Amino acid sequence: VYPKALRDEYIMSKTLGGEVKLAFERKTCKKVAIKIISKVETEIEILKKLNHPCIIKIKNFFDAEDYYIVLELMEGGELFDKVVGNKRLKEATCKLYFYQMLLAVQYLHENGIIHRDLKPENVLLSSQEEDCLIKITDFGHSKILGETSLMRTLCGTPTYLAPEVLVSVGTAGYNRAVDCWSLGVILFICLSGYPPFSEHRTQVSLKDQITSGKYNFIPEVWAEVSEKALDLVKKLLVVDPKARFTTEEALRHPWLQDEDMKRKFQDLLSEENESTALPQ
């Protein structure tokens, strides 16, 4: 059965997609989504402190036989369902969604959080309309940046310190780049309807495809996509994490300098919000 404290506040309903259930908050008679994780504490603390229009908000939490995370309901479901079975979005729709993913992840990295599991299943859409807000979810693998062991190590004289630790200094502090790579793979899929690295009709192992950076490029699928969109993908799918585009660099890329797209996003934000009166 559902835990009593959850029942006290919510009426549970149908499965939306771990499971995600529709529920109704009794107080408001409004819909919520309830993520059930079978037996997270850090994920909750992260979700509670973040405040961005493209990051899912937590409404409630119950730690019982299973975990119950109560969230705002995103009516449009998961991005995965828009791109599965070779389905692909209009380039303009890709740009609107990708811009928002970039804003969200930029906000995470500014706030010292790396997501580490960005994928279409973790991108939620606000409605069944093509032009909609998106929100990232699932901080179950996310890492909080703070002062490292390495930093403390480097404060003393390395008389006794192993060479591999001094070697690691060249690359330390780029862990956030893994999110930019996943973004690149998401963008590749949204624009083309097929993954850049996979075992479908190829002899090269998945690992080798990825570490070499040699994505599967099929000209015929890509001919209808703009040069600028592909140029961004290429800058994100860079094997060297120090050379890989950051979210700031991606947000400055020509493909994203799109006044009409940005207007649409601003309009959608305005429509979402229920603000109080304000002075002047």
Next chain:
Amino acid sequence: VYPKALRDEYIMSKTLGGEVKLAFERKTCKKVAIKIISKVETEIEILKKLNHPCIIKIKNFFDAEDYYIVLELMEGGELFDKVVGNKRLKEATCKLYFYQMLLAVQYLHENGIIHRDLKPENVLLSSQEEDCLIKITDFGHSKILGETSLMRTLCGTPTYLAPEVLVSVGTAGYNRAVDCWSLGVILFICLSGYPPFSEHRTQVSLKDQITSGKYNFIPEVWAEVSEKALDLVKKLLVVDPKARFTTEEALRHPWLQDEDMKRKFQDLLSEENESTALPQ
């Protein structure tokens, strides 16, 4: 002032060497050492669970204005004081002490603990006699091995996973090798009376000396040391952490196949212990 709960149980005395104070446990009238760390929880939990004759034991803990760690008193003081100012130990004494450091660190790695700050200041001697027991201390930088993020990452399909993470797999799980490198540096110092890497009369930076593995070799100091002892040092001061000797490999090295040394250690252990009667 000292915290009341500490005063209740102990009478505090002179400074031995953060500070380390001599104190007397009131209950037994016996000497203890009290490490004061100015404002650790993990260090205490580690110290409480470890049980090896060459690892310092915790007797008590007080979390007050400062931390107070009550330990067994090692009358011989720190190894640092035996090797400072170019002083150097007889090779036989080096071997007896190094054997015990190896046993201690082998026990740590078997138990999923990496020390990460091995140095002469953290090696304590049981008496002012040359032939004595040694115990490692200071787990303030120590790391507890468990299931990694990497392990969980590798359980799924790396469709979205960044190449640097797959690259890291080749070297993961050798973090314990940093202790073997520090051991090598300790052994180098004990045998020679001088550090292998330093800025004394040289143009090469300390970092470069270390990452290249090019220790300062002075033939005249080393002529009186055995070939076998230096051979062990060389196998520990190996730049590649996957090729570097482990504690098991070091314990199997010819230099440590010394029946007389091992007999001395066994005799010293026997002398330390106050056991109860036993059956048969």
